[PDB]
Amino acid sequence: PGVTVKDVNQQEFVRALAAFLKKSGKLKVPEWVDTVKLAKHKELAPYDENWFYTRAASTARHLYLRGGAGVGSMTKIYGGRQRNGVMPSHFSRGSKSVARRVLQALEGLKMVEKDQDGGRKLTPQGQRDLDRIAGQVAAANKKH
């Protein structure tokens, strides 16, 4: 029963983690998730109705893969093409408050621990949870 998150399809791992967070029930969801835009370079609201859980799941997995990351690094990770009009396109960071409240909601789930180093890292119980969903996807992948 020894499996690792790194030996799992990352996309399906994010989807399964989002499903686990959704059927978990308790999670701090802001009231403006249906009006927010996720970056200054993005154009529309996301098509997925429950994008917040997927974002929190991907955030938790990113803190698993490389910890010690703050809000600024998380905005650096999710940046993209700013289509500046007739101007040449550039690179722009994501929305700061969205990532900040994602981290605040996840530490409200006691899954993310504040660090003396300066950033944030993953709790050991959160690591156990991530290993449990990783084993779930491994079982649903190698047997199907």
Partner: protein
């Protein structure tokens, strides 16, 4: 009891560490099927599909990759894995297996052992 090789393409350098194992091929803590350009997947199974899992029975190989892009990293990965197997069969296996494997790989393609000397120019 172990060997350490490198393989470069443009800028990407993949370092391969090979030892006595149980038939597992690992890169950056991820399985070889778990690298994000699955379109270019058969290029990185070319040593395995060319050579079979029978001679990869007791080999543990780890690859850590720095720099480059995506395609150059994949070519560095396959080159590093192949050089690791060749050096392992040099140091710990006989020489006839070495020349047989080298003949098969060279008659397949040349880039999988020798690196492209061309790089980005000023």
């Amino acid at each position: 009891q172990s060997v350490q090789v490198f393989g470069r393409k443009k800028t990407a350098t993949a370092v391969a560490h090979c030892k006595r194992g149980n038939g597992l091929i690992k890169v950056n803590g991820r399985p070889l099927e778990m690298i994000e350009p699955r379109t270019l997947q058969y290029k990185l199974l070319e040593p395995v599909l060319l050579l079979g899992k029978e001679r990869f029975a007791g080999v543990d190989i780890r690859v850590r990759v720095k720099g480059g892009g995506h395609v150059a990293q994949i070519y560095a990965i396959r080159q590093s894995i192949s050089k690791a197997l060749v050096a392992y069969y040099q140091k710990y296996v006989d020489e006839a297996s070495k020349k047989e494997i080298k003949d098969i790989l060279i008659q397949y393609d040349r880039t999988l052992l020798v690196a492209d000397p061309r790089r980005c120019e000023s």
